[PDB]
Amino acid sequence: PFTADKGKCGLPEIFDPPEELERKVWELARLVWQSSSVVFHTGAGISTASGIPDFRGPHGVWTMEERGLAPKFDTTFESARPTQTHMALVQLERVGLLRFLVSQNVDGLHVRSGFPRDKLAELHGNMFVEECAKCKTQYVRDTVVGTMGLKATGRLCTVACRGELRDTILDWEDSLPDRDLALADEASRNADLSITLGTSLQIRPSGNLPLATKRRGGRLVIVNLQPTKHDRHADLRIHGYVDEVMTRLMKHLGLEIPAWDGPRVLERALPPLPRPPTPKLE
Ligand SMILES: Nc1ncnc2c1ncn2[C@@H]1O[C@H](COP(=O)(O)OP(=O)(O)OC[C@H]2O[C@H](O)[C@H](O)[C@@H]2O)[C@@H](O)[C@H]1O
Ligand SMILES: O=C1CC[C@@H](C(=O)O)N1
Ligand SMILES: [Zn+2]
Numbered sequence: 001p002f003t004a005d006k007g008k009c010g011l012p013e014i015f016d017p018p019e020e021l022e023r024k025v026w027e028l029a030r031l032v033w034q035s036s037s038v039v040f041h042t043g044a045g046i047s048t049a050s051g052i053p054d055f056r057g058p059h060g061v062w063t064m065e066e067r068g069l070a071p072k073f074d075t076t077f078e079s080a081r082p083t084q085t086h087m088a089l090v091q092l093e094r095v096g097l098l099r100f101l102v103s104q105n106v107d108g109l110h111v112r113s114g115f116p117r118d119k120l121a122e123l124h125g126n127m128f129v130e131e132c133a134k135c136k137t138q139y140v141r142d143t144v145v146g147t148m149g150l151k152a153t154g155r156l157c158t159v160a161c162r163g164e165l166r167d168t169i170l171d172w173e174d175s176l177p178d179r180d181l182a183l184a185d186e187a188s189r190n191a192d193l194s195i196t197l198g199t200s201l202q203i204r205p206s207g208n209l210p211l212a213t214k215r216r217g218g219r220l221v222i223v224n225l226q227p228t229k230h231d232r233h234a235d236l237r238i239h240g241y242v243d244e245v246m247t248r249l250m251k252h253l254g255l256e257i258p259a260w261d262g263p264r265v266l267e268r269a270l271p272p273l274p275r276p277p278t279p280k281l282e
Helices: 019-033 046-049 059-068 084-094 176-190 206-217 242-253
Strands: 038-041 100-103 121-122 127-131 138-140 153-156 166-167 193-197 219-223 236-238
Touching: 019 193, 019 219, 019 236, 038 084, 038 176, 046 084, 046 100, 046 242, 084 242, 100 176, 121 176, 138 153, 176 206, 193 206, 193 242, 206 219
Parallel strands: 038 100, 038 193, 100 121, 193 219, 219 236
Antiparallel strands: 127 138, 127 166, 153 166
16 A cells, blocks of 8 residues: 555656647548457546546656645546447447457446446456355446445345355455456467557556557557557557547447446347448558
8 A cells, every 4th residue: 555556656648739649540540441350448537537537647646646645526427428439439349440459447337338247347346246255256236335345245146155245445465357358368469459548557467468468560559649558569559539539430340339228237138230431551
């Protein structure tokens, strides 16, 4: 908590000017079209447009903490709506243009967005998910599980067990869930396009996964307002708001960003939906 390295916090924001931004979002378009296996990696930056502050941005939790100030939340976790970005990733999965989604976010919004859990690795866990210590059954709740650091919640497993239910929020010392990390790693290795959205890429091994795609000749796209640990290993860096980038991209892709019907949980990815015919690229 005190000994914890919170990495580089408060680094200046970069804003690509409009014409560099329009060109970079078309190139990202081209790369989605060109790619067989696309993995998205998300961090706290995709939730700030929902009122949830990030960790290391100008008003990040750790950033403000360093300057003796407090993060501000403009919502509760329960009343937080998924962003245009969140709902773009749902539609990209539904049309078969997103193979796997890796998130370091505990804010619960990917799942609440209707995003299929069998295509999602939540590397730092989920505020709404408790897990039985025995059968390992996960309960996705409507309100945040009131503990952090993998403690007893109070409730017991109800599988046809009475096992002690614990939060999925990793403490500083707790290693990542093996299943989620294993699937996030395999997806990242096999990807030919890893795209990062609103992460500074500073936490091992979460931040390193997008680099594995680069091995084997995979392309790496970083989308982030601030520099990030692996900017140098990126084939494309887009310095702008992810909502704006993802709305331009979906628009280039011929895709609608679907309505969020409110909190819904989808265990398994449904069969893929029609998508637009691809442009002639080369
Ligand atoms: N609307 C936006 N559009 C684009 N980028 C944004 C936006 N808002 C913020 N950013 C950028 O988004 C980036 C967010 O980076 P960080 O704040 O480190 O969050 P993490 O997900 O990487 O933190 C990882 C873990 O570390 C913690 O200890 C917890 O365990 C976390 O799970 C910044 O560079 C912002 O400039
Ligand atoms: O508990 C917290 C503090 C910051 C917020 C987030 O997901 O960014 N989660
Ligand atoms: Zn159980």
